[PDB]
């Protein structure tokens, strides 16, 4: 448990390398800020495993990047609705066309 | 086309067939070639070497004829088309223009002197080669053609 | 509920074809199961199938005398309840004769044998048996009829009634039957219930039960539910820790340890094909996890240079540059991939834009259906 | 009790003209269809019928002539348009066939005197009379007497009311020939008319099919694809045995042709593999690109797209092959080493591939704009699909369109006949 | 539309296989050992 | 791009109803 209480430290220094990664655009993968390998396993590796889902919300680059993206528009209800909205529809069109086959024949 | 079902086969039929086939690539009616192709499925088959020289050009044209354009006039001198074979030679296909050459792959003087050179359209071919407003106009008309089918 | 037919039989009668030159292996308990309940027409068939065992079926045939001693006793019972003026022991005295003949061999056990006591059924708990039995017979000699009919009998009404242990039993059956078959997230969903699943006849043990979950898990979950399900499941953990090289293996992901990630990846690839059961679709097992791999490592990067993947997978280049070609292809991977840069991108968000995707790709199918009931209705 | 069958079946057929006959004075299509298809499905169904069609009303081939000449008008065409099907059905094949089409030819006669109830309903019995002269016509050969007298009709097809059937069969005169007759279609084009009623909805995938059927005789795949599949869609019926499986062939061998590469999942129905498995054998070899195992399947199943009008098609396949499998890998990478997909594609040398890819630059797969230097081959897509600008008309008029098909609507609120 | 003669388990799945239908003659084993080589 | 997905979404939801509206409600023959 200590081990992850030292991953759980490295967690609370992600704020740390929250702060690395929050005054500039990053584009750097030089760790002189932290002390760590400048690739001490895919750099500091925490923007790696970070990266996926619980993110800083970047993208890296592999060529030196680290650079925030800042998704400003996910929640666009419009999609969602939309295609709920025909999902429904079409499920009642196929009711009709049942409706109309027996009415017809 | 005439039935005529006294019609007796002569080698003269299938020779004559080809000529007109080897022409129709020559005069670039590929849709007319296939056409007469299939109008013949019994001669091409295996047999009928009298036009078998043409459907292997126009393999040869679909594919890389222009390596292939001497392969096939090597592949068999003659079949009856001594003259017949020299319309579609002299009628070499020049679609390759739309590369670089001229001092840019040099190899592909008359022919760079053609019209001035190649055939004569663009330049030297080593030196050869966004608006809303625009947009509103025609993008008002849909809109009220929309609007239009409201009316009733 | 019962052992009634040897799904260790059956394992050891499949593996009996490539790998059929370890004849201690397999052979001496095959026959050892032989001379086991009386179990006639497998080992018959087994016979003709390859070998002949010349005098040493004359024993066998002997104790088919011993059946005839089992099917005269029947008569006997039979006519013992017969006279009996008591009902449901006919029933109970033919149910046992179907299940000595069912050990004997499928067709006299089955059928009749069985449908006949399955036509007198006072108890619904007995015939919900009866066709636990059918199902478990059907699946031994893969049976895909059988097995449909007997999972709609239990499903239909015999499910109908108070039988918590009746309703785990047929999850798992039907959970194996899905993994026979390719499809995988029916079985990931239904091997829910590891924390109760008895010892149950038709699975070896435990250990092989928790080993086909975790597989089935690791394709069809998503790493959000994957962390939440598998990798905290308690009993699951106990599991993986019976068995070293599937706990490496699937931890392996999850941490992103990658070419040890590949070297399980091999392992386990073996042991697919040797099993039986699941071996028929091993090549999409190991391409799917490929797949999975690729997709999530290049999630995280916007770009990637090739000599990365080479050192996060085998030192080697060529191959992950056919593989991704040729996934890149099959329209998975959702990259593209570059040469002489060597280099490789990401490509459309979903939400972003796929969105817009999306609605029309269903849009399009909802005009081709009004379109159609347009046609039919306007004469 | 062979009569008690015939005792229930053939009577229902004097309550059904009774029908037509007083809806004929209302005024028809809005009744005759059902008649029609119970003419259809009796017809399936198929002795003494020929006694007992003796005159209905008042005020084998005597049985056929006695009517009339006893004391005797879209009943009676019916009548004369129906006496057929015993002998149909029963397919006799012999001059009895001979003594049918004079009904057909009296009908004939007697149909073109009339003209619009008739244009209503004995118009379209017209194109199964036409059916059977074009069967009639196949059991001994083609004839254009048909074609000339379609021809003549077409004027009146072009008055008050037009039904279509004409052209399926000015194409089925066309496939008689097949390979052979090439400039009728090349007539059929300028000779197209709109017919967009598609009453029958059945002739017009029937001439859909032979319509991509010719498109694609000129490798106008571009088309004969959208074509070929749109009237896969207008097919609901069974039509399975031999029916839909030459449309499949023809729509699969395009497409093959055309680049893509499919997998039997699409399809896999169960009535198919034993007539279509050998095209599943070619398209399988094509898509890995074994030359060897090509002729090999060529050569093994000789006939087939001999019998089935493809065999020059996949002919020539044989060399667009190559096309084919490139469409992948230009597909696929952004930058590509042009030695390295030589030796992909086994090509003969760097020259050779990239005169193929120039070849190749024409129109389709994304450009190559191919530097003839170390960028060697680029194929740089398109970006920026993204909603935005880029697709503004990409994802615009794609949405127009798909909105302004919404002329169902006035369709539907202009349908309603409310009677009374 | 007549007049027209010619005429999971097993299905789901032909994709898969077909994709890969050459390959497999490795067995990702065979693709270790040549890998290890490297 | 939203305008004109909410005007597809609008024609689609009308063509449904006006044709329930229609034959659904006028094909009623009533012998």
Redesign the interface.
């Known amino acids: 448990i200590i081990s992850t209480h030292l991953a759980k430290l490295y967690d609370n220094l992600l704020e740390q390398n929250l702060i690395r990664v929050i005054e500039p655009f990053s584009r750097v993968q030089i760790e002189h800020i932290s002390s760590l390998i400048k690739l001490s396993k895919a750099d500091v590796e925490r923007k790696l495993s970070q990266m996926i889902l619980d993110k800083k919300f970047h993208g890296i680059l592999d060529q030196g990047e680290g650079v925030l993206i800042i998704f400003d528009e996910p929640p666009v209800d419009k999609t969602y609705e939309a295609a709920l909205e025909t999902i429904q529809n079409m499920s009642k069109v196929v009711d009709s066309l049942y409706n109309k086959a027996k009415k017809l024949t | 086309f005439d039935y005529k079902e006294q019609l007796p086969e002569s080698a003269y039929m299938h020779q004559l067939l080809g000529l007109n086939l080897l022409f129709l690539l020559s005069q670039n009616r590929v849709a007319e070639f296939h056409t007469e192709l299939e109008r013949l499925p019994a001669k091409d088959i295996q047999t009928n070497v009298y036009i078998k020289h043409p459907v292997s050009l126009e393999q040869y044209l679909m594919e890389g004829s222009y390596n292939k354009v001497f392969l096939a006039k090597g592949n068999i001198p003659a079949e009856s088309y001594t003259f017949f074979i020299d319309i579609l030679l002299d009628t070499i296909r020049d679609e390759i223009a739309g590369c670089i050459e001229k001092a840019y792959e040099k190899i592909l003087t008359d022919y760079a002197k053609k019209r001035g050179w190649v055939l004569g359209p663009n330049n030297y071919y080593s030196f050869a080669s966004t608006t809303i407003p625009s947009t509103e106009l025609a993008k008002q008309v849909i809109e009220y053609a929309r609007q239009l089918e409201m009316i009733v | 509920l019962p052992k009634n037919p040897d799904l260790r039989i059956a394992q050891l009668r499949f593996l009996l074809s490539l790998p059929e030159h370890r004849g201690d292996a397999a052979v001496r308990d095959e026959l050892m199961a032989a001379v086991r309940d009386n179990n006639m027409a497998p080992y018959y068939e087994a016979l003709c199938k390859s070998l002949d065992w010349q005098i040493d079926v004359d024993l066998l045939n002997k104790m088919k005398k011993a059946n005839e001693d089992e099917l005269k006793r029947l008569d006997e019972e039979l006519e013992d309840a017969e006279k009996n003026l008591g009902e449901s022991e006919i029933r109970d005295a033919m149910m046992a004769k179907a299940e000595y003949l069912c050990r004997i061999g499928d067709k006299e056990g089955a059928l009749t044998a069985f449908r006949k006591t399955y036509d007198k059924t006072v108890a619904l708990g007995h015939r919900l048996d009866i066709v636990f039995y059918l199902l478990r017979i059907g699946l031994f000699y893969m049976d895909n009829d059988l097995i449909t009919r007997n999972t709609e009998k239990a499903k239909s009404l015999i499910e109908e009634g108070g039988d918590w242990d009746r309703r785990n039993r047929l999850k798992v059956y039907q959970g194996l039957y899905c993994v026979a078959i390719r499809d995988f997230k029916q079985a990931a969903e239904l091997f829910l219930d590891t924390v109760s699943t008895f010892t149950s006849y038709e699975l070896m043990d435990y250990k092989t039960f928790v080993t086909y979950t975790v597989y089935v898990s690791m394709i069809a979950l998503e790493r959000p539910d994957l962390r939440e399900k598998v990798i905290k499941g308690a009993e699951i953990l106990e599991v993986l820790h019976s068995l070293p090289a599937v706990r490496q293996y699937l931890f392996s992901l999850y941490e992103c340890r990658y070419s040890v990630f590949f070297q399980s990846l091999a392992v386990v690839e073996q042991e697919m094909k040797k099993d039986w059961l699941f071996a028929p679709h091993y090549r999409y097992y190991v391409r799917e996890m490929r797949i999975h791999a690729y997709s999530q490592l290049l999630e995280s990067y916007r770009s990637l240079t090739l000599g990365y993947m080479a050192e996060a997978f085998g030192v080697g280049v060529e191959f992950i540059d056919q593989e991704l070609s040729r996934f890149i292809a099959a329209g998975r991977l959702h990259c593209k991939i570059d040469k002489v840069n060597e280099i490789v991108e990401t490509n459309r968000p979903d939400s972003k834009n796929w969105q817009y995707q999306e609605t029309i790709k269903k849009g399009d199918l909802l005009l081709n259906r009004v379109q159609k009931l347009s046609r039919v209705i306007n004469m | 009790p062979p009569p008690a069958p015939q005792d229930v079946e053939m009577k229902e057929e004097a309550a059904t003209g009774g029908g037509s006959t007083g809806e004929a004075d209302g005024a028809a299509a809005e009744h005759s269809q059902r008649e029609l298809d119970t003419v259809t499905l009796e017809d399936i169904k198929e002795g003494k019928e020929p006694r007992f069609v003796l005159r209905a009303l008042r005020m084998l081939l005597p049985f056929l002539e006695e009517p009339m000449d006893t004391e005797a008008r879209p009943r009676t065409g019916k009548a004369a348009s129906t006496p057929l099907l015993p002998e149909v059905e029963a397919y006799l094949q012999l001059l009895v066939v001979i003594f049918m089409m004079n009904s057909k030819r009296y009908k004939e006669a007697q149909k073109i005197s009339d003209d619009t109830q008739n244009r209503r309903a004995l118009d379209l019995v017209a194109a199964k009379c036409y059916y059977y002269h074009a069967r009639v016509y196949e059991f001994l050969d083609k004839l254009d007497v048909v074609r000339s007298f379609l021809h003549a009709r077409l004027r009146t097809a072009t008055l008050r009311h037009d039904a279509d059937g004409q052209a399926t069969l000015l194409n089925l005169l066309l496939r008689n020939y097949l390979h052979y007759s090439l400039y009728d279609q090349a007539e059929k084009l300028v000779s197209k008319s709109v017919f967009p009623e598609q009453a029958n909805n059945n002739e017009w995938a029937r001439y859909l099919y032979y319509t991509g059927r010719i498109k694609a005789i000129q490798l106008e795949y571009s088309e004969a694809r959208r074509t070929m599949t749109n009237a896969l869609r207008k097919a609901p019926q069974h039509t399975a045995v031999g029916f839909k499986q030459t449309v499949h062939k023809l729509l699969i061998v395009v497409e093959l042709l055309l680049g893509e590469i499919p997998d039997r999942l699409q399809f896999r129905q169960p009535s198919l593999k034993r007539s279509l498995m050998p095209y599943f054998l070619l398209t399988q070899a094509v898509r890995t690109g074994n030359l060897a195992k090509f002729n090999q399947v060529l050569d093994q199943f000789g006939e087939k797209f001999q019998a089935d009008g493809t065999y020059t098609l996949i002919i020539r396949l044989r060399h667009n092959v190559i096309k084919t499998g490139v469409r992948m890998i230009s597909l696929s990478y952004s930058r590509i080493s042009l030695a390295d997909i030589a030796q992909k594609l086994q090509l003969d040398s760097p020259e050779d591939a990239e005169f193929i890819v120039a070849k190749a630059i024409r129109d389709g797969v994304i450009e190559a704009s191919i530097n003839h230097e170390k960028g060697y081959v680029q194929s740089k897509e398109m970006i920026d699909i993204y909603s935005t600008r880029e697709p503004q008309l990409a994802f615009h008029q794609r949405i127009s369109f798909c909105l302004d098909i919404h002329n169902m609507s006035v369709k539907a609120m202009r349908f309603p006949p409310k009677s009374y | 539309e007549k007049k027209q003669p010619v005429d999971e388990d097993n299905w789901d799945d032909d994709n898969v296989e077909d994709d890969f239908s050459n390959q497999l003659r490795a067995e990702l084993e065979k693709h270790g050992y040549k890998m290890e080589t490297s | 791009?939203?305008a004109?997905?909410?005007?597809?979404?609008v024609?689609?939801?009308?063509?449904?109803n006006?044709?329930?509206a229609?034959?659904?409600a006028?094909?009623k023959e009533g012998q």
């Open positions: 791009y939203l004109s997905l909410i005007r597809s979404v024609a689609l939801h009308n063509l449904i006006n044709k329930i229609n034959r659904d006028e094909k």
